Write a protein that binds this ligand. Structure first.
Ligand SMILES: CC(=O)N[C@@H]1[C@@H](O[C@@H]2O[C@@H](C)[C@@H](O)[C@@H](O)[C@@H]2O)[C@H](O[C@@H]2O[C@H](CO)[C@H](O)[C@H](O)[C@H]2O)[C@@H](CO)O[C@H]1O
Ligand SMILES: CC(=O)N[C@@H]1[C@@H](O[C@@H]2O[C@@H](C)[C@@H](O)[C@@H](O)[C@@H]2O)[C@H](O[C@@H]2O[C@H](CO)[C@H](O)[C@H](O)[C@H]2O)[C@@H](CO)O[C@H]1O
Lengths: 289, 285
């Protein structure tokens, strides 16, 4: 097993198209998340809506439809092939920033003149049910046909709400089975989930993810056998080659540390490289960072 | 030993625009020389031109707005906000030449309400001097401060002009790539992208972005004049075609007459086979 020999600041967020600019732990270290993107086991099994490439992250493709009530997209995978609702919550790469309005900038796939972009404004209201294969939108432009695009920004669902990018959508319409990647639980003994943060335009400031996207593709690519209960990593300064801290990478595909009281990995340099050290017991006792 | 990514072509990103690869092709004129500044990396992992490591750094721009009596523009920085020192441009800077760019940016600092996006409309005329650290733009919005964003679409420089995404800007340059050997054609990895010219509807690049990061990551020694690759169906394990990967960081094939790699399925995986001679003759594909 290896992890990417790439400094953290050259790694991409797995939940928005952006670069990671820092690590942190959640304010409440007992907080449980259930992100659907950035999810992959160490053996290379993609979970939830997680795609392989950073350029599949938080993107949408579909064919425009129009009814008496308004317009929407009948969803496909990002390559235009049929969406696998039977096994995933939404097309691979579909955004997972819950409980907010989305603004998605799309273009028509077969394109002679004029502004080609449409901004699709999507609400996560009662009828938002991407697992069933469609979403509705409003737009100040006139999108038609096969539209492909990327999440541009997010905003509050209602005037005066806030956006909490730590939430995920409700993919179903009702008891509807949506095939969610399971929750990630802080594993105990003072360990905290490490969140990789990126700047992103959130109107009412950073989006967390649990694996850098290149870690995901690395695991898919290697299909490495898991030879222990956890993988001990060192976070190494690439210029001085000093070990800046110990981290644990778990088979289910997330990373923890023991944050120093009043601190944590948010106080570490953001240009370090994670390096696999050894397979260890689930209860390997980390030095605080 | 040298390896290439164990990832099917349709899960690989373009290295010149933020998009996925959806086919391979050869140039209409198989003698055509290109000089792309992104997607450039040697097999040993040496980045060239403006090529960044991550797919989410491809064709992005960051800088501080200046807006004066004389004009508006960006004083460019690197994508992480650190100073750009006058390489052709900051890493990741777009390399789609001879066209207007439309770049959608947000204020990194922003703590205000409202539409956070600005579309920066950029022309490749006189004030376009990214090598010197600035470009000018017009915008129907009001961007201020530290703006970070991504190339959204491109359009003709002048009314009636066409956009040719095989061109690069006038900005250090990564060197031209000349079709090598006998009968070989450079393989171009294509992505759909909003180009508002004619029927063009595509972007070529010479290395998938994940190939670039793979080489940077691996730093493998070059042990021969060229690496023979097989393009393999990952389910049946059949070899679908022979390709040659050159140390300077590009791929060739010998296309069957009237055809070529554009006829191959896009779910195949490149696999290193062996080191071969610079004049190893490929099986037509
Ligand atoms: C005059 C009109 O009907 N539209 C103007 C835009 O031009 C149209 O859309 C552009 C993208 C091209 O497809 C034109 O052929 C078409 O008429 C014009 O858009 C600007 O076009 C410039 C070319 O002269 C250039 O590409 C520029 O980047 C682009 O923004 C806009 C902006 O001036 O004005 C419309 O009225
Ligand atoms: C000045 C004004 O009335 N602007 C309206 C937009 O609302 C502003 O910008 C949004 C993003 C929020 O920051 C508001 O607090 C601010 O007044 C409005 O934007 C829409 O806001 C909705 C929330 O009520 C929701 O987030 C929606 O997704 C977003 O588009 C736009 C669109 O209705 O209209 C402007 O006039």
């Amino acid at each position: 097993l290896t992890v990417p020999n790439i400094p953290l600041n050259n790694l991409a967020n797995s939940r928005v198209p952006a670069m990671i600019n820092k690590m942190t732990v959640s304010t409440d270290q007992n907080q449980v998340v259930q992100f659907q993107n950035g999810r992959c086991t160490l053996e290379g099994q993609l979970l939830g809506t997680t795609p392989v490439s950073a350029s599949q992250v938080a993107r949408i493709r579909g064919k425009v439809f129009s009814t008496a009530s308004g317009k929407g997209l009948n969803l496909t995978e990002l390559d235009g092939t049929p969406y696998h609702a039977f096994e995933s919550p939404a097309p691979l790469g579909f955004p997972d920033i819950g409980a907010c309005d989305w603004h998605v900038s799309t273009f028509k796939v077969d394109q002679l003149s004029g502004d080609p972009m449409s901004r699709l404004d999507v609400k996560q209201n009662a009828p938002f049910a991407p697992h069933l294969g469609s979403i509705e939108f409003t737009s100040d432009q006139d999108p038609t046909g096969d539209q492909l695009g990327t999440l541009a920004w997010v905003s509050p669902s209602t005037s005066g709400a806030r956006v909490d990018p730590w939430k995920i959508p409700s993919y179903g319409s009702t008891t509807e089975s949506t095939h969610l990647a399971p929750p990630i639980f802080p594993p105990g003994f003072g360990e905290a989930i490490v969140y990789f943060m990126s700047d992103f335009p959130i109107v009412s400031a950073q989006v967390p993810c649990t694996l850098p996207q290149e870690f995901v593709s690395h695991f898919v690519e290697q299909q490495a056998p898991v030879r222990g209960e956890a993988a001990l990593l060192h976070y190494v300064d690439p210029d001085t080659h000093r070990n800046l801290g110990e981290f644990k990478l778990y088979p289910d595909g997330f990373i923890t540390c023991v944050p120093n009281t009043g601190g944590g990995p948010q106080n570490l340099p953001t240009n370090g490289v994670f390096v696999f050290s050894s397979w260890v017991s689930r209860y390997y006792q980390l030095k605080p960072v």
